[PDB]
From a paper:
The 5' region of pre-rRNA that consists of the 5' external transcribed spacer (5' ETS), 18S rRNA and the internal transcribed spacer 1 (ITS1) is co-transcriptionally packed into a terminal ball of ~40 nm in size. These particles represent the earliest assembly intermediates of 40S and are known as the 90S pre-ribosome or the SSU processome. Within 90S, the pre-rRNA is cleaved at sites A0 and A1 in the 5' ETS and site A2 in the ITS1, yielding a 20S pre-rRNA intermediate. The fully assembled 90S contains an unprocessed pre-18S rRNA, U3 snoRNA, approximately 51 assembly factors and 18 r-proteins with a molecular mass of 5.0 megadaltons.
The EM densities were docked with the available crystal structures of yeast 40S ribosome and AFs or homology models of AFs. The 3' major domain RNA is directly bound by [name], Emg1, Utp30 and Imp4. [name] adopts a superhelix structure and contacts helices 32 and 33. The 3' basal subdomain makes up part of the front face, whereas the 3' beak subdomain sticks out to form the nose. The structural role of helix 44 and six assigned late factors (Utp30, [name], Bms1, Rcl1, Pno1, Utp20) in the 90S structure provide insight into the last major assembly event. They function to assemble the 3' major domain (Utp30, [name]), the 3' minor domain (Pno1) and the 5' basal subdomain (Bms1) and to establish long range connections between ribosomal subdomains (helix 44, Bms1/Rcl1, Utp20).
Author numbering:
A (entry chain C): 360 to 405
B (entry chain A): 205 to 401, 403 to 466
Write the structure that this text describes.
Amino acid sequence: QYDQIINGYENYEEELEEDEEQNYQPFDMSAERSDFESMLDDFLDN
Amino acid sequence: ALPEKVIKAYTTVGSILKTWTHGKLPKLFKVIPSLRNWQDVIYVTNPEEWSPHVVYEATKLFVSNLTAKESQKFINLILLERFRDNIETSEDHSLNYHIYRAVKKSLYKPSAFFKGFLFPLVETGCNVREATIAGSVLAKVSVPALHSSAALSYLLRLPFSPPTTVFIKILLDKKYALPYQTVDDCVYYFMRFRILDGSNGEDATRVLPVIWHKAFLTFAQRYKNDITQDQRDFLLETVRQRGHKDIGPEIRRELLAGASR
């Protein structure tokens, strides 16, 4: 309850650090939705 | 670096967003929350030049479609900065009502708001006008007692400042039920401004604004029945040493009307 959440607040900066350390990926086009480039194309053609 | 098709496409949507006021957001903009690297792409749209309309709609869009951790980053990197920038550079130091409503909407994910907006703000030179505007949002929007309490505890443990005290008072005024540990933190907070005849820090003699006294009074009215007799005595002593001409007697009165837990 309160036990859980207060610890997440007190160390919010640390948890952001740890989340980025774990889940950061550089940009990769083949790692995003496969219709992405196709959407980029329809748009650059107005 | 990003594919140049990305840069070229999102540089243009960026220009659309400078003047957008209504209708549907560009489709390419609306797919950004569906992307893993939304942070990399978003920057190309040049968020600080978005119209205030777009700030609002983007806040709705991003806060309700990102995870809390991800929402928190959006709130912090984009919303907070816009909030501060606009208040500092406006002629009457007011906030554009679109941005204002964006901040209200962001409170819908209270944890992402406190970690992404409030805590960074009070810990990075929040001024009184900033606390007054952001504080009025916090006053108006309902927040879960649990998150409200946890944020109150966090603010009470911070070094004193008048803007922080503004938020402390706002969260007290919610008059929600408090976990006994937050009640305790409140007692410890007001306690720490008394004079101990040996070791004292600045808090014992610093000048206290009226807002500190209204917060003390608020805590006394709502929570007089949730403190121990020992705690009541520390606070009555606090009021004796540090009390205010008009508010001090009211606080004392409320503290003496309370029954011990």
